[PDB]
């Protein structure tokens, strides 16, 4: 039932144990698929799919490869300088969440969020870096230094507003054959632990589905039983998913209940399991 969205999410994990020990690791997601991997040990961004470069030429990919190499070295050098200036103690952990989403015909949406020790400190907005609603005093000082760099502001603007929506459309076109993949789930009913004395737990398992958009509801014929506990969509190594949907019901009201599964691979033929 849910709409399949395809934003490009470029994630960066930078750890600083001491002034001497550091590593920068990253990856790229196109929706729920991982297209790229980036280790501190390698000098290039690793392609995971045969269609990961998109419609970009070898020359265009090399320019990005160059920007990421210069960025990592520069980023890892700037944090050490900032920690010395703003008197910030090690260990340090910085996270970057950059990317965009393409809306064919209409204007594209972009983002660049930076977190410090799991909390939002700043983000790129329009043509400059901007602090979070509530941000420590040392963030405003780091922003004063960061906003003085005309070149980085222009590189980030050009990467987000220009390069990124182009790259997304290229991936959507080069990987389309793999993006239309459908993997039918296996479903079954079970009785989970007793939640109360005169009550029982109904469990509906949906296993091995791809893509991730799914709909699972406990039903009384056609009446949607609000009180369905969907839980987390858990991952499988083969890129398929797992989901459990439970329902707390007092003994007797379990009769006439069913579980309705809606998924794209089912081609309209919903899985309906009666308890």
């Amino acid at each position, epitope marked *: 039932v849910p709409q399949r969205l395809f934003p490009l999410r470029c994630l960066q994990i930078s750890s600083f144990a001491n002034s001497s020990w550091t590593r920068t690791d990253g990856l790229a997601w196109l929706g729920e698929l991982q297209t790229h991997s980036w280790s501190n040990d390698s000098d290039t961004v690793r392609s995971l799919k045969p269609w990961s470069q998109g419609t970009f030429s070898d020359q265009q990919w090399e320019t990005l490869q*160059h920007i990421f190499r210069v960025y990592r070295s520069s980023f890892t050098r700037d944090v050490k300088e900032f920690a010395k200036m703003l008197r910030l103690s090690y260990p340090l952990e910085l996270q970057v969440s950059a990317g965009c989403e393409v809306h064919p015909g209409n204007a594209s949406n972009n983002f660049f969020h930076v977190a410090f020790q799991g909390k939002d400190i700043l983000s790129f907005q329009g043509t400059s870096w901007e602090p979070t609603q509530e941000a420590p005093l040392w963030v405003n000082l780091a922003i004063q230094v960061l906003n003085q*760099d005309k070149w980085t502001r*222009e590189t980030v603007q050009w990467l987000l507003n220009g390069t990124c929506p182009q790259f997304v459309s290229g991936l959507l076109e080069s990987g389309k054959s793999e993006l239309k993949k459908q993997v039918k789930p296996k479903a079954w009913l079970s009785r989970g632990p007793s939640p109360g004395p005169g009550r029982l737990l109904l469990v509906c398992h949906v296993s091995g589905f791809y893509p991730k958009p799914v709909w699972v509801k406990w039903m009384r014929g056609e009446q949607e039983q609000q009180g369905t506990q969907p839980g987390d969509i858990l991952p499988n190594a083969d890129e398929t998913w797992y989901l459990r949907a439970t329902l707390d019901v007092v003994a007797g009201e379990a009769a006439g209940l069913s579980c309705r599964v809606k998924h794209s691979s089912l081609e309209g033929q919903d899985i309906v399991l009666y308890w």
Partner: T-cell receptor
Framework: MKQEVTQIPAALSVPEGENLVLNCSFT??????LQWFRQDPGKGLTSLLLIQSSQREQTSGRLNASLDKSSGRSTLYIAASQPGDSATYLC???????????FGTGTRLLVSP | MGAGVSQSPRYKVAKRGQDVALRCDPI?????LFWYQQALGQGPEFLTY????????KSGLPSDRFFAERPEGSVSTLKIQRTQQEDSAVYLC??????????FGPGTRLTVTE
């Protein structure tokens, strides 16, 4: 796409006092800055003018240099040319996520007295 | 200029096959260093780029014979091993701050002869 900087004309012999125009074209419009240089035989670059991506025009003495990213063009105007201006004039650009200058081949300018 | 980039040797005549070393003393405090190659009646062509001590762009380097260094983030040397006639050129060195407005040295005129 690899940046290609082109300068028209390759050579120009002009009489003293004349207002001359030097052309520069580039295929990649994602420019960080554009730098015009002067070079005397046989080595050493003298910085003349620098136009920033936001900037449209820059002046200094008898020199005026315009930048048009959308048409991929830069012009260097020399007012009331003197024999002392006689040199090779080079146009170069730095692209948005780059550091290196990509240069044209140059205009060999000769201003006869 | 008085307080600019220095290069040495200003002129070098080398025998074919010999090793040559070219030095560049950038403007004090300039984080960025660039090497360029300029052939006779041609525009300068980028060789390599240094940001502090790191050689972050080596795309212009023609072959294995060309190797550049800047170990202390100041002085840079460019070494050409087993020099050939085609290596004859002006080697220009430049330095800049973060604005990337490049200040060029007087260059090294290298002539490689039999």
């Amino acid at each position: 796409m690899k940046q290609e900087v082109t300068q028209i004309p390759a050579a120009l012999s002009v009489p003293e006092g004349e207002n001359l125009v030097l052309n520069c074209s580039f295929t990649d419009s994602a420019i960080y800055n554009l730098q015009w240089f002067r070079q005397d035989p046989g080595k050493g670059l003298t910085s003349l003018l620098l136009i920033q991506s936001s900037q449209r025009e820059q002046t200094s003495g008898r020199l005026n240099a315009s930048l048009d990213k959308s048409s991929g063009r830069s012009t260097l105007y020399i007012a009331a040319s003197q024999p002392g201006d006689s040199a090779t004039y080079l146009c170069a650009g730095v692209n948005t996520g780059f550091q290196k200058l990509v240069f044209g081949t140059g205009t060999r300018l000769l201003v006869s007295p | 200029m008085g307080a600019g980039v220095s290069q040495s040797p200003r002129y070098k005549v080398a025998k074919r096959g010999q090793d040559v070393a070219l030095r560049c003393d950038p403007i004090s405090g300039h984080v960025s260093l660039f090497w360029y190659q300029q052939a006779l009646g041609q525009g300068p062509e980028f060789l390599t780029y240094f940001q502090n001590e790191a050689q972050l762009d080596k795309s212009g380097l023609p072959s294995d014979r060309f190797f550049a260094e800047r170990p202390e983030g100041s002085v840079s040397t460019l070494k050409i091993q087993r020099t050939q006639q085609e290596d004859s050129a002006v080697y220009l060195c430049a330095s800049s701050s973060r604005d990337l407005e490049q200040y060029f040295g007087p260059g090294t005129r290298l002539t490689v002869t039999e």
